[PDB]
């Protein structure tokens, strides 16, 4: 079932363009909710641009998939469990496939720059397998993602503005805990075209806004318990020098004996909001982070919807 062997992962389209198949190397899981990770080096050492993703997911088994970019994977193995870790350095997300939430295409002219001196040398593919019902026959699985690379330089460059809580603590029982993140945007204009939220099972609602002279332009709002793909932004949102990116995850503490804090495990929590943007080639940077809350009181003027779960 859909597994190349003798043809390999690389597939020339044209001189410049080519397609690359990041697949699992015939793994079979033992247990449910298993996170498998494997890496692919880039075939070229020159800078390239990623411009498309086709999900190749066997529908009767794969919960979700993620693709990152980094310079140093965690394992040197053929595959590994992602609890060991994805990338030792900063792992940069590019694509998120979710079952039951069809992903959107990248806008035309937009590509993530990869490789070269500065960009990512590796891809790491994280596959989340749900149930084991279809593996009764013990068949090796080759699920993954074909990607479209090219050396033709693209007019617009994709990047990611990661907003995350670092020092949150949820007291057990506590009915409502907000996790507020805010930073002054400090670069050339970006335009936001997608977003993903990630929390674990206590996340009620994550929301993120651009605030320009006091008024709260919404970017994205989602219940993290819904499938965590990138979702499209209604009308693309520019974000200019001086603007403030605010975001608020909202957590409950109920159904918990001890206090929850930020971390990797299932017992711990996360408040990540990934805002995919594009910038003009000449002005572009590929990654931005915000772990602060530089404008804390400002969250009184927050919209209501941010605190209203659905």
Residue ranges in contact with Cu ion by CB under 5 A? 270
Residue 145's binding partner out of Ni ion, Cu ion, none, with CB under 5 to 8 Å set by partner kind: none
With breaks defined as C to next N over 2.5 Å, after which residues does the chain break? none
The Cβ of residue 173 has, within 10 Å, a number of other Cβ atoms equal to 12
Of 129 and 277, the one with the shorter C-beta distance to Ni ion is 277
The helix/strand/coil state of 195 is strand
Contact assessment for residue 155 and residue 280, using Cβ atoms and an 8 Å cutoff: yes
Of 190 and 290, the one with the shorter C-beta distance to Cu ion is 290
- CA–CA distances in Å: residue 62 to residues 123, 129, 299: 19, 4, 39
Of 45 and 238, the one with the shorter C-beta distance to Ni ion is 238
Of 270 and 275, the one with the shorter C-beta distance to Cu ion is 270
Residue 238's binding partner out of Cu ion, Ni ion, none, with CB under 5 to 8 Å set by partner kind: Ni ion
Shortest distance in whole angstroms from residue 7 CB to Ni ion: 43
Residue 218 half-sphere exposure toward CB, CA atoms < 13 A: 13
Residue nearest to Ni ion (CB): 238
Task: For residue 25, count CB atoms less than 10 angstroms from its CB and return exposed for 0-12, middle for 13-18, buried for 19 or more.
Answer: middle
* Residue 238 is a binding residue for Ni ion (CB under 5 A): yes
Shortest distance in whole angstroms from residue 303 CB to Ni ion: 21
3-state SS track over 111-146 = EEEECCCCCCCEEEEEEEECCCHHHCCCCCECCEEE
* Residue 280 is a binding residue for Ni ion (CB under 5 A): no
User: Segment near Ni ion (CB under 5 A), from 62-70, 82-90, 201-209, 236-244?
Assistant: 236-244
Residue nearest to Cu ion (CB): 270
Site track for Ni ion across 129-168, x = CB under 5 A:
----------------------------------------
Among 45, 4, 34, 35, smallest CA distance to 22 is for: 4
Of 54 and 191, the one with the shorter C-beta distance to Ni ion is 191
Of 40 and 82, the one with the shorter C-beta distance to Cu ion is 82
Residues that bind Ni ion in the complex, under the rule CB under 5 A: 238
């Amino acid at each position: 079932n859909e597994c190349l062997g003798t043809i390999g992962p690389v597939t020339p389209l044209d001189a410049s363009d080519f397609a690359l198949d990041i697949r699992m190397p015939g793994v079979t899981p033992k247990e449910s909710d298993t996170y498998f990770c494997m890496s692919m080096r880039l075939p070229v050492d020159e800078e390239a641009f990623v411009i498309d993703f086709k999900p190749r997911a066997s529908m009767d088994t794969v919960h979700a998939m993620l693709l990152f970019g980094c310079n140093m994977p965690s394992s040197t193995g053929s595959y590994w469990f992602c609890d060991e870790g994805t990338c030792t350095d900063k792992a940069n997300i590019l694509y998120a496939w979710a079952r039951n939430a069809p992903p959107t295409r990248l806008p035309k002219g937009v590509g993530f720059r990869v490789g070269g001196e500065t960009g990512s040398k590796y891809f790491v593919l994280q596959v989340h397998y749900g149930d084991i019902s279809a593996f009764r026959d013990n068949h090796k699985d080759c699920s993954g993602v074909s990607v479209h690379l090219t050396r033709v330089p693209q007019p617009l460059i994709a990047g990611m503005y990661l907003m995350m809580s670092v020092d949150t603590v949820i007291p057990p029982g506590e009915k409502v805990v907000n996790a507020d993140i805010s930073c002054q945007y400090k670069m050339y204009p970006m335009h936001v075209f997608a977003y993903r939220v990630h929390t674990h099972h206590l996340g009620k609602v994550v929301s993120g806004y651009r605030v320009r002279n006091g008024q709260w332009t919404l970017i994205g709002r989602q219940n993290p318990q819904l499938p965590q793909a990138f979702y499209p932004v209604e009308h693309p949102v520019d974000v200019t020098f001086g603007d403030i990116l605010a975001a608020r995850c909202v957590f409950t503490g109920e159904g918990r004996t001890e206090a929850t804090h930020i971390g990797g495990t299932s017992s711990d929590e996360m408040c990540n909001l990934y805002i995919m943007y594009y910038m003009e080639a000449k002005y572009a940077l590929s990654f931005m982070t915000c772990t602060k809350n530089v404008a804390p009181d400002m969250f009184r003027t927050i919209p209501a919807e941010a605190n209203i779960p659905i």
